[PDB]
Design an enzyme around this catalytic site. Structure first.
Site, mmCIF file in Angstrom:
data_model
loop_
_atom_site.group_PDB
_atom_site.id
_atom_site.type_symbol
_atom_site.label_atom_id
_atom_site.label_comp_id
_atom_site.label_asym_id
_atom_site.label_seq_id
_atom_site.Cartn_x
_atom_site.Cartn_y
_atom_site.Cartn_z
ATOM 1 N N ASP A 1 0.870 -1.187 0.000
ATOM 2 C CA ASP A 1 0.000 0.000 0.000
ATOM 3 C C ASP A 1 0.901 1.229 0.000
ATOM 4 O O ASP A 1 2.074 1.147 -0.385
ATOM 5 C CB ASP A 1 -1.036 -0.066 1.167
ATOM 6 C CG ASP A 1 -2.323 0.680 0.846
ATOM 7 O OD1 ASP A 1 -2.274 1.916 0.685
ATOM 8 O OD2 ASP A 1 -3.374 0.028 0.757
ATOM 9 N N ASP A 2 0.361 2.373 0.390
ATOM 10 C CA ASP A 2 1.152 3.609 0.306
ATOM 11 C C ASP A 2 2.487 3.425 1.019
ATOM 12 O O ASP A 2 2.558 2.943 2.141
ATOM 13 C CB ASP A 2 0.356 4.763 0.927
ATOM 14 C CG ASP A 2 -0.854 5.145 0.094
ATOM 15 O OD1 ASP A 2 -0.737 5.044 -1.135
ATOM 16 O OD2 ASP A 2 -1.838 5.621 0.682
ATOM 17 N N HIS B 1 1.975 1.307 -3.228
ATOM 18 C CA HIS B 1 1.152 2.258 -3.962
ATOM 19 C C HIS B 1 1.798 3.637 -4.108
ATOM 20 O O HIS B 1 1.105 4.590 -4.491
ATOM 21 C CB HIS B 1 -0.240 2.385 -3.324
ATOM 22 C CG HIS B 1 -1.018 1.088 -3.395
ATOM 23 N ND1 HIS B 1 -2.331 1.071 -2.876
ATOM 24 C CD2 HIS B 1 -0.740 -0.132 -3.876
ATOM 25 C CE1 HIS B 1 -2.786 -0.166 -3.068
ATOM 26 N NE2 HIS B 1 -1.867 -0.909 -3.671
ATOM 27 N N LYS C 1 -4.908 12.300 -3.041
ATOM 28 C CA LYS C 1 -6.277 11.752 -3.015
ATOM 29 C C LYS C 1 -7.081 12.475 -1.948
ATOM 30 O O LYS C 1 -6.688 12.536 -0.798
ATOM 31 C CB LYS C 1 -6.337 10.217 -2.824
ATOM 32 C CG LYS C 1 -5.209 9.593 -2.062
ATOM 33 C CD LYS C 1 -5.354 8.110 -1.852
ATOM 34 C CE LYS C 1 -4.016 7.666 -1.207
ATOM 35 N NZ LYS C 1 -4.203 6.505 -0.396
#
Ligand SMILES: *[C@@H]1O[C@H](CO)[C@@H](O)[C@H](O)[C@H]1NC(C)=O
Ligand SMILES: *[C@@H]1O[C@H](CO)[C@@H](O)[C@H](O)[C@H]1NC(C)=O
Ligand SMILES: [Cl-]
Length: 333
Positions: free
Chosen positions: A171-172, A193, A226
């Site tokens: 993920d991030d 990510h 985001k």
């Protein structure tokens, strides 16, 4: 002043030099350290966390001007005992975050190995907080795509620097969720990510972020900003990307979007983005054949976005809907 168990941890008041020995944190326990102002805490062994039903954080350290000397030791979260492909969305309970670091000081040279889900939560701070030379090794989570929501660093804090770190995850690499004056410099991110601001939620404000000198490989996105479509009373303002080298990107080189959780469509207007630049050293981003280079999906964005130092190659063109902002490139269309 030597911590040998979860119960020793409460007895460090008065120590300016704490030694954190290696041990197991048993099921149903957490490890909490509240060191004296200015104390040095030195790790002398690895700390393994038995499979637990508790909510995270499983380790919390909170103090002012702490000097944490990791000596390359490991916090082992036993993440493969939890991973099920669903992370914190569903499925098995995941203790998260694994570690929580609050206050101020300098944290160096330790590893988080196999966090159940999100690895290191940062904030709030009371002065500058620097994380330097930390490895989040969640590489084992790649197997069968079982690791999920294994964020390296989740930051809700002011006055943070994260530098010289390595994150191998799903993920991030970093998600900057709230705060002012945050620097992410000379880090290496792979498997996950990419380097993120957000998701920005209602009432959260990220400002004065410098993303400089990082390398991102084998990731789903290069950089992202985001914001939840529904967020209000929120903002991202003053972001500089400088000298980043990014390659092996599967989905988007750059995705700046106010439609989250969607990539595009009916972007929100309540989390304005302003003053987002790619300046200084070249930020070069190479994307995979099926990937998109750059998409900007704004319902409410402002400023003169100087993207002169961005070059994105590979894949296909994205779309630019920048609202009031004027983007001056750069090479990516
Ligand atoms: C969790 O998964 C079940 C299906 O197994 C589904 O009914 C439920 O609504 C899901 N919830 C979330 C929050 O994703
Ligand atoms: C911490 O950030 C707060 C808000 O950004 C700012 O007012 C303060 O001066 C910063 N402190 C330090 C030590 O940087
Ligand atoms: Cl338990």
């Amino acid at each position: 002043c030597t911590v040998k168990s979860v119960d020793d941890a409460k007895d460090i008041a008065g120590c300016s030099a704490v030694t954190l020995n290696g041990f197991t944190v048993p099921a149903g326990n957490t490890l909490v350290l509240n060191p004296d102002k200015g104390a040095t805490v030195t790790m002398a062994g690895d700390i393994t966390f038995a499979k637990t039903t508790l909510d995270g954080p499983l380790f919390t350290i909170d103090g002012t001007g702490i000097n944490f000397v990791g000596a390359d030791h490991i916090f082992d979260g036993n993440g493969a005992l939890y991973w099920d492909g669903k992370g914190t969305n569903n499925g098995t309970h995941k203790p998260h975050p694994f570690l929580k670091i609050k206050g101020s000081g300098t944290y160096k040279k330790f590893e988080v190995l196999n966090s159940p889900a999100q690895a290191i939560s940062v904030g709030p701070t009371d002065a500058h907080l620097t994380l330097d030379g930390i490895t989040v090794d969640d590489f084992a989570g790649d197997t069968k795509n079982l690791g999920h929501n294994t964020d390296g660093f989740d930051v809700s804090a002011n006055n943070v620097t994260i530098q010289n770190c390595i994150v191998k995850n799903q993920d991030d690499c970093i998600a900057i969720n709230d705060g002012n004056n945050i620097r992410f410099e000379n880090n290496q991110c792979s498997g996950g990510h990419g380097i993120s601001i957000g998701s920005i939620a209602t009432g959260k404000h990220v400002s004065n972020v410098v993303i400089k000198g990082n390398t991102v490989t084998r990731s789903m996105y290069g950089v992202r900003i985001k914001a939840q479509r529904t967020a209000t009373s929120a903002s991202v303002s003053g972001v500089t990307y400088d000298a980043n080298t990014i390659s092996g990107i599967a989905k988007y080189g750059v995705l700046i979007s106010q439609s989250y959780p969607d990539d595009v469509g009916n972007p929100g207007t309540g989390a304005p983005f302003s003053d987002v630049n790619f300046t200084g050293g070249a930020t070069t981003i190479k994307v995979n054949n099926a990937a998109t280079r750059v998409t900007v999906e704004c319902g409410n964005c402002s400023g003169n976005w100087n993207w002169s130092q961005l070059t994105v190659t590979g894949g296909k063109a994205g779309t630019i809907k920048s609202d009031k902002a004027k983007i001056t490139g750069g090479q990516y269309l």
